[PDB]
Design a protein around this ligand. Structure first.
Ligand SMILES: [Zn+2]
Length: 187
């Protein structure tokens, strides 16, 4: 999916990580793909070249990468949906959750029925040039009944208070047991 830096120069950033066997979350710049373990927090950076209007929001949503599966809503597999690992905020069917934010909104589109999690857009902290949001994926890419080995993309959109699109940028994701190993291979 095409990126849209838009009027505010919106784009994502990821900390530099290696491919060590014990790494729990590692991003690959050449593949623009995030490799992470189940339920492990992944810090994603939000960069802008100009401050967005007040009341702006940041939405995260997963879609299947391959054309033939793109219309299918991405959800947790039945097994994980019933494992009772809820934090009291996120519905059990949602794949993506946010951690460390007091204002997450777990939404379900009234027309497409796709899931997403939204948090307020907040400026970078003192002496910082990016904002960090911590995301976690509650299902493995291999989960049958779920993503079933189908690659997904995580679309991050910057929206105004009215829900209008301001910016967009995405990355592929693979939720596996050994992020370090899989990254080097795919690379
Ligand atoms: Zn699962």
């Amino acid at each position: 999916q095409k990126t849209y830096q838009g009027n505010y120069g919106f784009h994502l950033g990821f900390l530099q990580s290696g491919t060590a066997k014990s790494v729990m979350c590692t991003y690959s710049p050449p593949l623009n793909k995030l490799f992470c373990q189940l339920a492990k927090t992944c810090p994603v950076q939000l960069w802008v070249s100009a401050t967005p209007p007040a009341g702006s929001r940041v939405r995260a949503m997963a879609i299947y990468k391959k054309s033939q599966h793109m219309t299918e809503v991405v959800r947790r597999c039945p097994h994980h949906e019933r494992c009772s690992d809820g934090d009291g905020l996120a519905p059990p069917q949602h794949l993506i959750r946010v951690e460390g934010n007091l204002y997450p909104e777990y939404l379900e589109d009234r027309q497409t029925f796709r899931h997403s999690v939204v948090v307020p857009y907040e400026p970078p902290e003192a002496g910082s040039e990016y904002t960090t949001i911590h995301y976690k994926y509650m299902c493995n890419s291999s989960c049958m009944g779920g993503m079933n080995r189908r690659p997904i993309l995580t679309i991050i959109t910057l929206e105004d208070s009215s829900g209008n699109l301001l910016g967009r940028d995405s990355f592929e994701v693979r939720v596996c047991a050994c992020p370090g190993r899989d990254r080097r291979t795919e690379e």
